[PDB]
Structures are given as C-alpha cells and as structure tokens.
Write a protein that holds these residues in place. Structure first.
Motif: not given
Ligand SMILES: [Zn+2]
Ligand SMILES: [Zn+2]
Lengths: 8, 51
Positions: B18, B23, B28, B45, B48
């Motif tokens: 991200c 974050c 991820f 992401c 966020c």
C-alpha cells in the motif's frame, strides 16, 4: 505498484 | 512468522504494498485485493481507500 514474490 | 493483509496470514505468493505510509497493514496478498497482475502506478489498499 510495488510488489514482491514471497522468498523461499 | 509475521502476518499481513486483511486475512492476517503469513506472506505467500505475490504481495502488493500500500502506498499510504501510515497504512496499518502495508502488504497484501494479490488475490485478497482482487489482483492477478500488478496495477501500474501507485496503489492504495481497501482500508486506506474507504472513509
Ligand atoms: Zn490476504
Ligand atoms: Zn493501506
């Protein structure tokens, strides 16, 4: 985008 | 041992980062954020991106 391959 | 993503599992496969430095997750698993191939440019992401 920033990405990475899971190391083994 | 460390876990990541919204699934809170260990790293595996391709991971995407991200671009919000604040974050709370940072990395991820591609599939968890609906990706098969990396998007071009900066990416944020779902956590966020939403309110
Ligand atoms: Zn995940
Ligand atoms: Zn984020």
């Amino acid at each position: 985008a920033r990405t990475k391959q899971t190391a083994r | 041992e460390p876990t990541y993503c919204l699934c809170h599992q260990v790293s595996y496969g391709e991971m995407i980062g991200c671009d919000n430095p604040d974050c709370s997750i940072e990395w991820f698993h591609f599939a968890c954020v609906g990706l098969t191939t990396k998007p071009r440019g900066k990416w944020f992401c779902p956590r966020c991106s939403q309110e």
